[PDB]
Amino acid sequence: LKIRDAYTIVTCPGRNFVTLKIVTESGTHGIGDATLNGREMAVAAYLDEHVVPALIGRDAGRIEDTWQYLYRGAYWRRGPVTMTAIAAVDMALWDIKAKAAGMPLYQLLGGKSRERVMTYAHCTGQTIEDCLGEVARHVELGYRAVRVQSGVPGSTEKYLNHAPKLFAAVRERFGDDLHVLHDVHHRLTPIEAARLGKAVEPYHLFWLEDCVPAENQESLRLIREHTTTPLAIGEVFNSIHDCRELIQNQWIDYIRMPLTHGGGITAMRRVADLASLYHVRTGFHGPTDLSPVCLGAAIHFDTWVPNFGIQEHMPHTDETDAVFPHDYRFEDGHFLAGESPGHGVDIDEELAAKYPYE
Amino acid sequence: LKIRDAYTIVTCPGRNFVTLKIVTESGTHGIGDATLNGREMAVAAYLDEHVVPALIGRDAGRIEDTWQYLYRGAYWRRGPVTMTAIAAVDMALWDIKAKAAGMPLYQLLGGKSRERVMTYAHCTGQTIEDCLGEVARHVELGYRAVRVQSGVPGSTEKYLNHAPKLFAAVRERFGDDLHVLHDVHHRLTPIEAARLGKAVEPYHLFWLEDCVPAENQESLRLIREHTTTPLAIGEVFNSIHDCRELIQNQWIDYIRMPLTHGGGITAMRRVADLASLYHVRTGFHGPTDLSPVCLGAAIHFDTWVPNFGIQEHMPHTDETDAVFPHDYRFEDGHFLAGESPGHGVDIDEELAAKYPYE
């Protein structure tokens, strides 16, 4: 089944989303998320002006080959723009393949490893008290895990002294069963993150993510050597080469690279495999700037992957969900993979047209 | 589609072969090679007496889960018997899945990466001259690569001195285009293999395999540090853990672990992924004691895998091919993957019955 047509679709049902659609001569089509928040048009042009023309005429069943083919075109380079475009193509081809196989994507990957995928919600507030309120309502919704953030009265020093109080407060009010995560937004140096890790050890965090800027993977060594608080990193990584050392040296517990920014299903399957050799688990970055297409594919991946950790959940706007109909569902804090052939997500082009890029 | 029945089949159309067959309630079935040369009955009993009973009632689409499930039963242990049984189950389930998907196995894995898979033939003789004869006829058959072995007039010392003469002779008579491989059958110590590697450098071997006993992976260090002759190892490995260090330290160029002895498609997919991170390529062990079932699955794997190296070919007897009908074909020195749903191989139970275990 050759590729007869392929094109990008830019819509803004709440926020900008770029989608790639590929249609085979047999009529079957597939879509993949190509949204790169804050630089959306760079990817759109990349696909339109360079990738799409090359897709025409190619055999859509050659997923691996197309991935390698496009990777070569980028001159073997890893980059946010480069890998998002490739991931979009990869997601579309896997969509087409699963449909062609008449099975939901997770079946194509190796089958179900779990019935549902645990998620975590964002609980932020200006004060520790506000935050505790959010945690309260989210645990009501059934979430078994929450990411907690709050404002710091008054600076690195103030943050380091305040952070522990927040976690102490959450534990006093909610107990030890709840999984609590925290993002440090890479504001720290390795030794400062080490200090933070040690200070929050009594609160047993699920993870402490994005502790320090990690372009230099060795940055995590000092943290790992000084604390037993679990570490997560990589929401912004684009290649397995951005985390190969982190994983092989066992400096992290969760890899956060998401499908769209990490080259797609093909590439992340390999990162997950490498991670499993070292006890590292998946912890897919799941912000709103990652369309329901990515989310659906992510849920399928999460359903199959043996070393599954947790899935981030930042609910999309109703308009976004309308434009991107899907069969994955959220229930009692967990996601359930769809059972429809393909990744179970589609795009309503007409409705999408009613929401122009902004 | 639940597993309604599963059983082993032992036949001897030339040599002993153990096959596992799994049948789903929907009628669809799949088979996997479980032949462990010289200890065939150990695996047969393993499957019959312990694995089969546990397969009944399980969902055959859960390949990953079944793999992990059986791995746990073995108490997380890697072993020739243990992994062959698991590989048989894994091959059968992948067979069922591809059929269910209505596509040949290579399509299910990610599509075609190459049109045909290069092979190499065994060219042995009592004398260098006999060997050259075999090479002559095999290159006539279209083979682009050959493994050369010959008797040693007269001992490690005699072998070390004779080996270079054999390669010099093959190069003088056939030129530099031909790929020539050599198996040292682990008769050497690391420093002796290093010496051999250096001595044959002028003959540019495709590879020198099984240089030394490698249970201790560090055994390859000395060889790699003293020669630029390509190294291949692992025809007898059962786990990714038997070669993780060899690969990450770049001490080898080709991994030889085959599907049946290496836990199947599921497991070897991961080993191939790890290998690609370090320029290591696949070089599947393909003796006759590995049934056409394994060969068919191997050809599909070889067709997709990006870091494909070469496929070993030791033709089966006509009786073996009769008992195991298949759609893969050999042409001009290369294999062509079948296009039939599943891995394209089946077993004629009636005919198989006419050849009892020996």
Side-chain angles (χ1 to χ4, degrees), chain A residues 57-201:
Chain A
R58 292 184 58 92
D59 177 359
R62 305 186 75 207
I63 304 187
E64 187 66 57
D65 183 72
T66 303
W67 197 98
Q68 303 298 335
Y69 172 65
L70 293 179
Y71 191 65
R72 263 64 158 183
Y75 285 68
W76 286 258
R77 298 315 304 167
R78 47 174 178 290
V81 181
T82 305
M83 301 305 309
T84 297
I86 293 183
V89 173
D90 193 73
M91 254 181 272
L93 296 183
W94 276 103
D95 191 25
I96 289 173
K97 180 140 303 194
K99 283 176 177 175
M103 38 178 74
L105 182 57
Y106 79 83
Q107 284 288 35
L108 199 60
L109 303 179
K112 192 185 294 287
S113 282
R114 57 195 56 73
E115 230 58 63
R116 48 183 186 171
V117 323
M118 184 171 73
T119 282
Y120 72 80
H122 279 47
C123 296
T124 69
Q126 193 170 178
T127 74
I128 287 180
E129 185 52 59
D130 294 318
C131 178
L132 298 184
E134 282 301 288
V135 173
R137 42 167 300 215
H138 284 289
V139 292
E140 294 314 305
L141 296 177
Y143 287 94
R144 311 281 200 284
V146 296
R147 190 198 71 157
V148 300
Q149 314 288 310
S150 89
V152 178
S155 175
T156 299
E157 193 50 51
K158 293 188 183 62
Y159 168 68
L160 293 175
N161 286 314
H162 184 72
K165 296 183 172 70
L166 167 58
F167 310 126
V170 308
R171 286 296 171 202
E172 183 214 298
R173 178 167 303 183
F174 300 102
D176 306 309
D177 298 323
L178 186 68
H179 297 309
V180 8
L181 298 59
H182 180 73
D183 191 335
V184 342
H185 297 94
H186 53 283
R187 289 281 169 52
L188 278 26
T189 60
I191 207 61
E192 303 178 328
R195 167 184 162 191
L196 180 60
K198 285 162 53 180
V200 304
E201 266 170 36

Side-chain angles (χ1 to χ4, degrees), chain A residues 64 97 107 112 248 273 278, chain B residues 97 107 110 248 273 278:
Chain A
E64 187 66 57
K97 180 140 303 194
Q107 284 288 35
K112 192 185 294 287
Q248 297 181 337
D273 284 355
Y278 295 89
Chain B
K97 179 139 303 193
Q107 284 288 36
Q248 298 181 337
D273 285 353
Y278 296 88

